[PDB]
């Protein structure tokens, strides 16, 4: 059904907000959440695909709670470029005076002027970390929405989102989530109402692609049994132009970098007969030249494909130019795009066509349910490619008619329960062994694996001091809290602290060498004559190493791998040009970046680590390395970046002016104005005084 949103039990300016965004009826899943007492606060578990307005739900949800009842409502998910995205359509609710804010980036913080705030968005790592901190106003949080729930199956972030989901179980929630099969078994746990629906703005048609006798043919056999015939140089190209010329826009999903790559360009080739707007093209690629926070072949490559209307997509292009990408093609600009499967977990962004290259099964309906713009296609269509007609009958089985692997928790493992404990002992304080075994139970994970993980970790974190016994009771350490607080793995905290007491200081290059090596540290593609290169320099370093070289093939890959991200690390610190390093390491933008905010916390928590064990030859270098490594500078320019507003560049420009120090800017405040301009020159002198103050 479809519910008119003047039916809704809400004041009346409220029910005005929602009708401005051009909505004069609710959704079918929106009306089966009213009628389940959504707005009444019933503990819900809301199932459905990608473009069903979930989000419409999640905030009649929270604002029907704070309506009815006090405090504060917390908006949850796993992405951040999701939090950002709510967050700006969360912020029409200031209208009625509800103040809405995002938590911050940094985990050794309890976030306290939230205080102030009624609609809080966050994700998964941050809420937990939160609520190891204890924050008076996280008390008065009453109500989580708790978004992509299917998430408990994810190796890494599952364990995250099941200890948020308890402590929101005792309060009050709101789950929502893709498809989850074992969604009885999941609601119950959760002791919500479920509700599952299948419903879609765009019907979909799941077909399969296939080869015969004549080399240029190809069959699409599709779920209803429909047959169809294509031509062209392979089975992507020529159901990518079938598609095109009935004004669709087609998305490609191939499973590595280089090969989305390869794909888009080779499609480009083909794009002759295409209908683009070329005026509009020319634009983006202005717009694409004059991206600074990106690599130059990553533009120059991009280039030679936006003027074709395509464009490839992955985690190796920086957020700039994979946001230009999405929003080109969300105009209909860009009319192909292939991508790596991580664009199919990323924000809304349908295309007519989609084309599954390289085929779990929930990748694939995540992949597939992108195939339907909503307000624009009356069909959309996904299909899979096939190697051969005696494999279309096991694609349809597995991936078209068969339901996604249940979720499962992800708990039962040493590294994930370990930190669980630990957090379990922040956020209560002082536990018994039954007090705290009670918590563990709380898990999704089965009770007899339960059992096999927490006497396994009650003794780690015993043995390397994370814990200590009071009698009846167990409590973190000096230590262990101060680990509980930085947000880093407990297996992090002890190769550190083992790195820290074992060597007397040593150079940056083995600090940033030790961090990598950690289970929070980046990993990086590393070559084969690489890593043979990197063996080499390891005989060839003049500065002692923080770890022993280990005997274990797979632990002595990790040693290699963590000195590649030193290195890379280190010319990062040093200027070196960003388009020099990506393609001496042969490391993406996007890349770099990441790699650059995971050590930056890091650095900043091995700083915060040494000084808690009081080791502050270490500590001092530690620091210095931090702020090296959050801007990418020289020692040489650590006062200058303080400045709010002065980055890298700004302090380079000054630097090579005669511009040294901070005295320097407050003294010279014409030259400062002349190189920076008058407005920020201006604000820039403030700052330098009340720093040196």
């Not at 533009?299 to 920086?318: D, N, P, R, T």
């Given at each position: 059904e479809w519910m008119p949103i003047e039916d809704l039990k809400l004041p009346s300016n409220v029910i005005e907000i929602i009708k401005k965004r051009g909505i004069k009826k609710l959704n079918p899943p929106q009306t089966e959440a009213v009628k389940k007492g959504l707005l009444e606060g019933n503990r819900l578990l809301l199932t459905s695909p990608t473009g069903?307005?979930?989000?419409?739900?999640?905030?009649?949800?929270?604002?029907?709670?704070?309506?009815?009842?006090?405090?504060?409502?917390?908006?949850?998910?796993?992405?951040?470029?999701?939090?950002?995205?709510?967050?700006?359509?969360?912020?029409?609710?200031?209208?009625?005076?509800?103040?809405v804010a995002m938590t911050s980036g940094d985990y050794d913080t309890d976030d306290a002027w939230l205080k102030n705030y009624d609609i809080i968005i966050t994700t998964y790592e941050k809420l937990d970390s939160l609520w190891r901190h204890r924050p008076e106003?996280?008390?008065?949080?009453?109500?989580?929405?708790?978004?992509?729930?299917?998430?408990?199956?994810?190796?890494?972030?599952?364990?995250?989102?099941?200890?948020?989901?308890?402590?929101?179980?005792?309060?009050?929630?709101?789950?929502?989530?893709?498809?989850?099969?074992?969604?009885?078994?999941?609601?119950?746990?959760?002791?919500?109402?479920?509700?599952?629906?299948?419903?879609?703005?765009?019907?979909?048609?799941?077909?399969?692609?296939?080869?015969?006798?004549?080399?240029?043919?190809?069959?699409?056999?599709?779920?209803?049994?429909?047959?169809?015939?294509?031509?062209?140089?392979?089975?992507?190209?020529?159901?990518?132009?079938?598609?095109?010329?009935?004004?669709?826009?087609?998305?490609?999903?191939?499973?590595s970098r280089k090969m989305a790559e390869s794909t888009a360009l080779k499609i480009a080739n083909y794009m002759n007969f295409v209908s683009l707007d070329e005026n509009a093209l020319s634009e983006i690629l202005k717009q694409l030249d004059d991206i600074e926070?990106?690599?130059?072949?990553?533009?120059?490559?991009?280039?030679?494909?936006?003027?074709?209307?395509?464009?490839?997509?992955?985690?190796?292009?920086?957020?700039?130019?994979?946001?230009?990408?999405?929003?080109?093609?969300?105009?209909?600009?860009?009319?192909?795009?292939?991508?790596?499967p991580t664009l199919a977990a990323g924000v809304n962004l349908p295309a007519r066509t989609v084309i599954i290259g390289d085929i779990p099964i929930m990748e694939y309906k995540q992949m597939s349910g992108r195939a339907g713009r909503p307000g624009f296609d009356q069909i959309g269509e996904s299909i899979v490619v096939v190697r051969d007609k005696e494999d279309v009958d096991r694609v349809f089985k597995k991936y078209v008619l068969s339901d996604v692997e249940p979720i499962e928790s992800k708990l039962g493992s040493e590294r994930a329960f370990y930190t669980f404990l630990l957090g379990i002992l922040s956020a209560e304080g002082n536990l018994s062994e039954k007090q705290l075994e009670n918590f563990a139970y709380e898990s999704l994970l089965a009770k007899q694996l339960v059992d096999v993980y927490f006497d396994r970790a009650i003794r780690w974190l015993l043995e390397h001091s994370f814990i200590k016994e009071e009698g009846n009771t167990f409590a973190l350490t000096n230590f262990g809290k101060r680990v509980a607080d930085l947000y880093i793995n407990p297996f992090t905290a002890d190769i550190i602290r083992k790195g820290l007491e074992?060597?007397?200081?040593?150079?940056?290059?083995?600090?940033?060498?030790?961090?990598?090596?950690?289970?929070?540290?980046?990993?990086?593609?590393?070559?084969?004559?690489?890593?043979?290169?990197?063996?080499?320099?390891?005989?060839?370093?003049?500065?002692?190493?923080?770890?022993?070289?280990?005997?274990?093939?797979?632990?002595?890959?990790?040693?290699?791998?963590?000195?590649?991200?030193?290195?890379?690390?280190?010319?990062?610190?040093?200027?070196?040009?960003?388009?020099?390093?990506?393609?001496?390491?042969?490391?993406?933008?996007?890349?770099?970046?990441?790699?650059?905010?995971?050590?930056?916390?890091?650095?900043?928590?091995?700083?915060?680590?040494?000084?808690?064990?009081?080791?502050?030859?270490?500590?001092?270098?530690?620091?210095?390395?931090?702020?090296?490594?959050?801007?990418?500078?020289?020692?040489?320019?650590?006062?200058?970046?303080?400045?709010?507003?002065?980055?890298?560049?700004?302090?380079?420009?000054?630097?090579?002016?005669?511009?040294?120090?901070?005295?320097?800017?407050?003294?010279?405040?014409?030259?400062?104005?002349?190189?920076?301009?008058?407005?920020?020159?201006?604000?820039?002198?403030?700052?330098?005084?009340?720093?040196?103050?």
């Open positions: 069903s307005g979930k989000t419409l739900i999640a905030e009649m949800g929270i604002i029907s709670f704070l309506l009815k009842n006090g405090g504060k409502a917390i908006y949850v998910t796993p992405l951040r470029a999701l939090t950002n995205e709510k967050y700006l359509t969360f912020k029409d609710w200031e209208l009625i005076g509800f103040k106003w996280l008390n008065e949080v009453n109500y989580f929405v708790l978004d992509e729930l299917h998430y408990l199956n994810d190796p890494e972030r599952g364990p995250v989102v099941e200890s948020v989901t308890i402590r929101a179980k005792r309060r009050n929630l709101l789950a929502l989530s893709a498809t989850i099969s074992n969604y009885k078994q999941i609601a119950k746990w959760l002791g919500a109402e479920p509700v599952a629906t299948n419903w879609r703005p765009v019907p979909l048609i799941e077909g399969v692609i296939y080869p015969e006798r004549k080399k240029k043919e190809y069959n699409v056999i599709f779920k209803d049994n429909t047959t169809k015939k294509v031509h062209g140089d392979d089975a992507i190209i020529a159901y990518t132009l079938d598609s095109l010329s009935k004004n669709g826009q087609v998305l490609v999903f191939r499973n926070e990106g690599g130059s072949d990553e533009k120059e490559l991009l280039k030679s494909l936006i003027s074709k209307g395509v464009a490839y997509h992955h985690a190796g292009l920086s957020k700039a130019l994979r946001d230009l990408i999405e929003e080109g093609f969300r105009q209909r600009k860009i009319k192909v795009i292939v991508a790596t074992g060597h007397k200081a040593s150079c940056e290059l083995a600090y940033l060498h030790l961090l990598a090596f950690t289970p929070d540290g980046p990993l990086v593609s590393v070559g084969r004559n690489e890593e043979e290169e990197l063996i080499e320099l390891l005989e060839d370093l003049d500065c002692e190493l923080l770890i022993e070289e280990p005997y274990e093939e797979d632990e002595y890959s990790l040693y290699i791998n963590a000195l590649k991200v030193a290195l890379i690390m280190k010319d990062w610190m040093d200027e070196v040009d960003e388009d020099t390093i990506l393609s001496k390491y042969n490391i993406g933008s996007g890349d770099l970046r990441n790699m650059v905010e995971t050590m930056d916390w890091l650095t900043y928590s091995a700083y915060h680590l040494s000084r808690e064990l009081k080791l502050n030859e270490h500590a001092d270098k530690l620091r210095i390395l931090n702020l090296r490594v959050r801007d990418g500078i020289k020692e040489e320019l650590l006062e200058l970046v303080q400045i709010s507003g002065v980055g890298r560049k700004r302090a380079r420009l000054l630097y090579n002016n005669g511009i040294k120090e901070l005295g320097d800017v407050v003294m010279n405040p014409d030259k400062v104005k002349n190189l920076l301009g008058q407005k920020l020159g201006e604000k820039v002198v403030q700052e330098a005084a009340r720093l040196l103050n």
